[PDB]
Design a protein around this ligand. Structure first.
Ligand SMILES: COc1ccccc1CN1C[C@@H](C(N)=O)CCC1=O
Ligand SMILES: [Zn+2]
Length: 139
């Protein structure tokens, strides 16, 4: 679990969105595994606007943060789960590291701010859904 809070927005993994997230929907994209809902409270996370390929992510299945190198956002084939059939997920970044389904929502950060959230894993890889291209999150 986990979310990003910036301004009047809440960014979560689309497959973990609640009834309240869907009742206050701002934007969602199944191909990216992202959903953004509106909030009444003001959030103060900072979104990165950069092309970093190194950062640190939080792994709840180890209660640890890990430094990683990751690929630039791209279209990657993701095996089926109970939430999606096998498909290409867009705007995904991969790194070598540990990830279990419950790790989804853990933040990946660089020196400029939040880069994305855990969205995929297995076979010793971890995948992060990018948010750096969503410029409207700041306004
Ligand atoms: C071993 O599978 C994983 C490991 C870490 C994280 C996630 C998974 C598998 N997964 C993929 C998600 C997606 N983005 O398509 C949907 C929910 C889910 O359980
Ligand atoms: Zn950066």
């Amino acid at each position: 679990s986990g979310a990003i809070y910036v301004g009047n927005y809440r960014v979560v993994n689309r497959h973990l969105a609640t009834h309240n997230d869907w009742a206050n929907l701002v934007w969602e994209d199944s191909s990216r595994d992202l959903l953004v809902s509106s909030t009444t409270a003001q959030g103060c996370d900072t979104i990165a606007r950069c092309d970093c390929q190194t950062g640190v992510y939080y792994c709840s299945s180890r209660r640890k943060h890990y430094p990683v190198s990751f690929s630039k956002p791209s279209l990657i084939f993701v095996e089926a789960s109970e939430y999606y059939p096998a498909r290409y997920q867009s705007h995904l970044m991969l790194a070598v590291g540990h990830s279990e389904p419950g790790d989804c929502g853990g933040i990946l950060r660089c020196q400029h701010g939040v880069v994305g959230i855990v969205s995929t894993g297995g076979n010793g890889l971890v995948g992060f859904a990018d948010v750096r291209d969503l410029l409207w999150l700041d306004e």
